């Protein structure tokens, strides 16, 4: 079945664009990446950077994850991200989201060998 590392790429990586280009980014991405297949995932962040730059975060600043785990890491640099938050009009299967673009430090949880991002924890 899909690996945690591949899942992270599918849910959170968008190396193909530098930023969201319109308010419809989230609606299109959430759908296309299959995040709304079973239900409307409430929140999701997409990172507009190279895969290598995001994998490198696993060797940056170790910080506790929001849930207390100690396998989280914070990016030394800000990164281009897009926050997707479900709107009041969202109704499965017609999931709807508000798109928010920003430049923030990301916090990911890493695992494995190679040690790569498997979860997106927060943006700060």
UniProtKB/Swiss-Prot annotation:
State the function annotated in the UniProt record.
Endonuclease that catalyzes the cleavage of RNA on the 3' side of pyrimidine nucleotides. Acts on single-stranded and double-stranded RNA.
What species does this protein belong to? Bos taurus (Bovine)
According to UniProt, the tissues expressing it are described as: Pancreas.
Q: Which family does it belong to?
A: Belongs to the pancreatic ribonuclease family.
Q: What is this protein called?
A: Ribonuclease pancreatic
Query: Which superkingdom does the taxonomy of this entry point to?
Result: Eukaryota
Residue numbers binding substrate: 7, 10, 41-45, 66, 85
Swiss-Prot/TrEMBL catalytic activity:
an [RNA] containing cytidine + H2O = an [RNA]-3'-cytidine-3'-phosphate + a 5'-hydroxy-ribonucleotide-3'-[RNA]; an [RNA] containing uridine + H2O = an [RNA]-3'-uridine-3'-phosphate + a 5'-hydroxy-ribonucleotide-3'-[RNA]
């Amino acid at each position: 079945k899909e690996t945690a590392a591949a899942k992270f790429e599918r849910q959170h990586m968008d190396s193909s664009t530098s930023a969201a280009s319109s308010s419809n980014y989230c609606n299109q991405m959430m759908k296309s990446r299959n995040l709304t297949k079973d239900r409307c995932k409430p929140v999701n962040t997409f990172v507009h950077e190279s895969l290598a730059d995001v994998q490198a975060v696993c060797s940056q600043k170790n910080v506790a994850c929001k849930n207390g785990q100690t396998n989280c890491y914070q990016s030394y640099s800000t990164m281009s991200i897009t926050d997707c938050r479900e709107t009041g009009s969202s109704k499965y299967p017609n999931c709807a989201y508000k798109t928010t673009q920003a430049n923030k430090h990301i916090i990911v949880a890493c695992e494995g060998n190679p040690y790569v991002p498997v979860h997106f924890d927060a943006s700060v």
